[PDB]
Amino acid sequence: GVTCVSQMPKSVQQTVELLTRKLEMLGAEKQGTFCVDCETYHTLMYVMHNSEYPLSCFALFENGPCLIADTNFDVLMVKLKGFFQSAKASKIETRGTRYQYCDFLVKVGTVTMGPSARGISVEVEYGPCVVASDCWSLLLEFLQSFLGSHTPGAPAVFGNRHDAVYGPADTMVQYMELFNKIRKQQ
Amino acid sequence: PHWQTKLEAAQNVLLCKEIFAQLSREAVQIKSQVPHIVVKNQIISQPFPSLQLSISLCHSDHLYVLEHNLHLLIREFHKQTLSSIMMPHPASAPFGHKRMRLSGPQAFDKNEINSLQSSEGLLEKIIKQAKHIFLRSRAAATIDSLASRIEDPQIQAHWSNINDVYESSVKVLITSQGYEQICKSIQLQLNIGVEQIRVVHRDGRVITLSYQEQELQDFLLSQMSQHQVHAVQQLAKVMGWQVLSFSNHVNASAITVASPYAISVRNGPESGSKIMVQFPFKEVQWNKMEGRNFVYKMELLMSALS
Amino acid sequence: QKFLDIARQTECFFLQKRLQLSVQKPEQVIKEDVSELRNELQRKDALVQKHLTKLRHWQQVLEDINVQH
Amino acid sequence: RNQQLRTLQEECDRKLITLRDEISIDLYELEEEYYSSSSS
Amino acid sequence: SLQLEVLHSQTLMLIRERWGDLVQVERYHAGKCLSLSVWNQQVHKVTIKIPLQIFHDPKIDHLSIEKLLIDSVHARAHQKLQELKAILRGFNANENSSIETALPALVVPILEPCGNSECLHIFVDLHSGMFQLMLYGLDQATLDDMEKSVNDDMKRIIPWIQQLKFWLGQQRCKQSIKHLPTISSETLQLSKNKLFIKLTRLPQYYIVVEMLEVPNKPTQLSYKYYFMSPAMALLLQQFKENIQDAFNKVLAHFVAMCDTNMPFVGLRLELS
Amino acid sequence: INMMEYLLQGSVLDHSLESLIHRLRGLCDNMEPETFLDHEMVFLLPFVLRARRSMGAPWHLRYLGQPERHALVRNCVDIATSENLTDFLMEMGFRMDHEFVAKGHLFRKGIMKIMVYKIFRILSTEALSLSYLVELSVVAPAGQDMVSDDMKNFAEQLKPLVHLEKI
Amino acid sequence: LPPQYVDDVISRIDRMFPEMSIHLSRPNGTSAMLLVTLGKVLKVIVVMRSLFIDRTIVKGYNENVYTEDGKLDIWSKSNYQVFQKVTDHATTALLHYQLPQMPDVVVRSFMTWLRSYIKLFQAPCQRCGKFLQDGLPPTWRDFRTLEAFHDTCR
Ligand SMILES: [Zn+2]
């Protein structure tokens, strides 16, 4: 639906449990364990192995064409490695415990540039509607209970067309930006 | 053609033998919180506490809505193979459920894809139906019976013309004796689910429900006393009388009506009591007061006081 | 509009007051019950006649679609 | 033969629906009558 | 010998359709006996031995292995049902338990009056030999975790059935106020497994209940009042009035009447 | 998991086909075949890729490796992709040399598939060949000789009308 | 009422509201099953007999609408609580706008109600904050005064 991926930085590991505790106060059933994985290449391009879409592969660029491809798309990359530079620097995978709250599907996990685990990522995908930017007002007030005093003002992924489909693809663009900041610093 | 009819009977038997085999394997192999029993040719099962399903192949009570559905339901299972959906609109692609092949590459969710693949086979698709075919009867007979038993207000049921298996739609218009226009009041859309019924009340309240017949009958009776109280309010709006304190709930509802000497009334499912106030009050009993039915007697009483 | 209703709600009140007083001594309300119940049954039977001919008409075509098979 | 047989199934269904349609309106008018029954 | 061949061949055909993994067949020619191993997931073993006799180690004139297996397993299950009834006799000497004879059943009511919905229908499969108990409520996940635990050992139904009685009371209260305007909820964040409801109207007032098991099956609950002194002694007087006068319906009479009085009292407080 | 296909091709005259369509339809199990119209491309960086659009299914692309018995086998990995792939592969750097649409009918089997079609050249559709082509593409992970053998029996059944061999 | 009259009334409905789009498939016998899309926010399928609606299944824009073919598949409820609540509210609100005398107004009365739902997720309620106790936005519009207060709000 519509999501606001962000990072909320001592005791980084303790932050997830404390942050989860704040989520637990609201009350959300543990309905699974999400696992989002990112891969990196030279010419660049990223393939985002995302959870909750077991088939989709979500190949993407910095700002350009994005295609949704089934799980077999990965087999092309490994076999196509000859002409490209596969697994160029490091693969960043963020796995966390899914906390779906009364149709909000809000999840928080520690991003682990294997095995460092230096960051925290919050997934707040709001399933109901695809219309996102002219509907952004809803997500903020859900956030304000979850996190404290540092709500992300806007995700910035929205180009604000007259009629706006969002879908799942542009979320992976949002994930990349969070990963870009994590990779850039520490 | 004599040879034709002889062959047709054989084909029906071979198909029928398959149907029982499909049920018979499914019943014991898998469990769905129900104690299926297997006998020579009878697969005895207990979908409800008060129901017994005798799906019994008979070689040489009959609903014929459940029986026929087996023959047709099997074909859908047979159809799922070697169908036109399997083949890919793109010439080059592996054979696969068309809706499935477009699901993976279009980023469908973890839950929807799992739900589609979780088809229940045969026995669950019929037990759940018989789990609704008769739950409908227990909710249909009660509504039919309730109209005859209680004559004071008139239950009215407008049954929907499109009620597919696993669901049925209801209309309920609880109006008094004949005062349809002056007094139109609570009308609930009851929904007959597979396991439990579902109603949505007139005012907006939603009641999930129980599955037992007795629980439904109680709900209508509780809504019974509520309407008679609402009849007071509707008359207050249209009669020269003016409203006073209202108490929609507490089961029993009590309403008070002002007059330009007031009558304040408490009608629960077991109370049905009402009063005249003068100026300190005394009870009123209808068994001696006005005639046909409740609202007319209530309307006349107000036309007797003012 | 408010004058309309109150003067009318007073008018029916007078007649309604008569009704109960007119219910007691005469048998007319019982007589009207005789007619209303008779009319209700007559309407019931008329609905039946509408039912049967339509039901019989459908019975014919369904049989006709069977003889053709 | 598969073509001609499919028409019969579609043909009877079309008439079959109309039976259900007309019964729906006939049932609806009748259904009201039973509940309208006064004093019984 | 021919009869044994028919039973074995009939059994093999039977295995193809039913009891594919549930029953294993072992044929013996030296002793001229055939054995069927029903309930392979764990004990009962049925053996035909050559008059012709059947020996069970937990009347075949019908020569129907399917029917005979059903009768033998049905008899074994009923014995398994009887043993559990004796275990349920453990918690309470005065305990209401019923076993249906048409098909295996251990429908046992939990708390004082039943409606055939609170009774958990503990019936064991005559084909897989595993204990299955179903209740109308108790969200499925709780049902599966329990039924899984009790299945292996019988003694574990005695602890859990203790908590079901707690759950039925907790579930019972929610149903009664379900038509009243309220928001029923379980444990809540705070600024014996008590449950409470917060009214939609006048939200700043809460109504709470705490329950205990005084006699064997029945549970008694004491109504409490903790809203986030005024309208307290009057409620205590109301409690005495209720005592002087089902129990869940007594709850419903108590909730709504309070919900009507408090806003009226709140208006009085605002006036004064 | 990666699968390599078993396919081998042949062509059929126009007058011939009218018998072939009835021959194939009866011989294999199916109901009321479908006319498949797809518009295929080829992409070169050497890593020859084929992306096919069919007239509302998603763009299905496939790669065939170099051939590795009575059959022609090359490693294949076919992946379904959403729309706007063509511009995606433009940003990749791949260049499109030619594109051709294919028209015809395809019949199935237990595993193998038969598709009869004619190659249309695009500038605007023109018939590159007057005779259709038929192949017996079979997809099976961890290819073994057993799967290929079954094709030999079926090909022998179809031998009279059209004799087909891999190239 | 005549089958042709049903199409004219609903065709007239589409004209008033630009955002709403109505599709008349009529798969079953002379019982229009119009489908209404509220711009991009949500979809809905309503079954009606002889121009008297009796059901409303408010499926969100994300969720699919058909099953295996043009078959409308009215029954399948929404997978989200928010649209489930609207389904009940649409199921209940449909009734309150029923005038037995006139068939034209009831349909129009229901649509202006549905038209008021285009602003879902974006309008606070007059009583409390946009977002309520549970995970539902307003999901409740008054029949006469078009308020935004929630299900728990009165
Ligand atoms: Zn609110």
Curated annotation (Swiss-Prot), chain B:
Protein location: Nucleus
Annotated tissue distribution: Ubiquitous.
Lineage top rank: taxon: Eukaryota
Family: Belongs to the Mediator complex subunit 17 family.
Functional note: Component of the Mediator complex, a coactivator involved in the regulated transcription of nearly all RNA polymerase II-dependent genes. Mediator functions as a bridge to convey information from gene-specific regulatory proteins to the basal RNA polymerase II transcription machinery. Mediator is recruited to promoters by direct interactions with regulatory proteins and serves as a scaffold for the assembly of a functional preinitiation complex with RNA polymerase II and the general transcription factors.
Clinical condition linked: Microcephaly, postnatal progressive, with seizures and brain atrophy: A disorder characterized by postnatal progressive microcephaly and severe developmental retardation associated with cerebral and cerebellar atrophy. Infants manifest swallowing difficulties leading to failure to thrive, jitteriness, poor visual fixation, truncal arching, seizures. There is no acquisition of developmental milestones and patients suffer from marked spasticity and profound retardation. Progressive microcephaly becomes evident few months after birth.
Name of the molecule in the record: Mediator of RNA polymerase II transcription subunit 17
Parent sequence residues shown: 289 to 647 of 651
Swiss-Prot record, chain E:
Subunit structure: Interacts with GATA1. Component of the Mediator complex, which is composed of MED1, MED4, MED6, MED7, MED8, MED9, MED10, MED11, MED12, MED13, MED13L, MED14, MED15, MED16, MED17, MED18, MED19, MED20, MED21, MED22, MED23, MED24, MED25, MED26, MED27, MED29, MED30, MED31, CCNC, CDK8 and CDC2L6/CDK11. The MED12, MED13, CCNC and CDK8 subunits form a distinct module termed the CDK8 module. Mediator containing the CDK8 module is less active than Mediator lacking this module in supporting transcriptional activation.
Record-stated family: Belongs to the Mediator complex subunit 14 family.
Record function comment: Component of the Mediator complex, a coactivator involved in the regulated transcription of nearly all RNA polymerase II-dependent genes. Mediator functions as a bridge to convey information from gene-specific regulatory proteins to the basal RNA polymerase II transcription machinery. Mediator is recruited to promoters by direct interactions with regulatory proteins and serves as a scaffold for the assembly of a functional preinitiation complex with RNA polymerase II and the general transcription factors.
Protein name listed in UniProt: Mediator of RNA polymerase II transcription subunit 14
Domain of life from the UniProt record: Eukaryota
Annotated compartments: Nucleus
Tissues expressed in: Ubiquitous.
From Swiss-Prot, chain F:
Gene (name only): MED18
Family under the similarity heading: Belongs to the Mediator complex subunit 18 family.
The keyword Transcription regulation appears for this protein: yes
Organism taxonomic ancestry: Eukaryota, Metazoa, Chordata, Craniata, Vertebrata
GO cellular component: core mediator complex; mediator complex; nucleoplasm; nucleus
GO molecular function, one term: transcription coregulator activity
Assembly description: Component of the Mediator complex, which is composed of MED1, MED4, MED6, MED7, MED8, MED9, MED10, MED11, MED12, MED13, MED13L, MED14, MED15, MED16, MED17, MED18, MED19, MED20, MED21, MED22, MED23, MED24, MED25, MED26, MED27, MED29, MED30, MED31, CCNC, CDK8 and CDC2L6/CDK11. The MED12, MED13, CCNC and CDK8 subunits form a distinct module termed the CDK8 module. Mediator containing the CDK8 module is less active than Mediator lacking this module in supporting transcriptional activation.
Compartmental location: Nucleus
GO biological process, one term: RNA polymerase II preinitiation complex assembly
Keyword list, A-Z: Activator, Nucleus, Phosphoprotein, Transcription, Transcription regulation
Protein name: Mediator of RNA polymerase II transcription subunit 18
One Pfam family it belongs to: Med18
Keyword DNA damage attached: no
Main location: nucleus
Curated annotation (Swiss-Prot), chain G:
Highest rank taxon of the organism: Eukaryota
Record note on what altering G135S does: In NEDSCAC; uncertain significance
Ribosomal protein among keywords: no
Keywords for this protein: Activator, Cataract, Intellectual disability, Methylation, Nucleus, Phosphoprotein, Transcription, Transcription regulation
GO cellular component: core mediator complex; cytosol; mediator complex; nucleolus; nucleoplasm; nucleus; transcription regulator complex; ubiquitin ligase complex
Consequence of substituting P137L: In NEDSCAC; uncertain significance
Subcellular localization(s) per the UniProt record: Nucleus
Cystine connections: none
Biological processes annotated in GO: positive regulation of transcription elongation by RNA polymerase II; positive regulation of transcription initiation by RNA polymerase II; protein ubiquitination; regulation of transcription by RNA polymerase II; RNA polymerase II preinitiation complex assembly; somatic stem cell population maintenance; transcription initiation at RNA polymerase II promoter
Protein purpose: Component of the Mediator complex, a coactivator involved in the regulated transcription of nearly all RNA polymerase II-dependent genes. Mediator functions as a bridge to convey information from gene-specific regulatory proteins to the basal RNA polymerase II transcription machinery. Mediator is recruited to promoters by direct interactions with regulatory proteins and serves as a scaffold for the assembly of a functional preinitiation complex with RNA polymerase II and the general transcription factors.
Organism (species): Homo sapiens (Human)
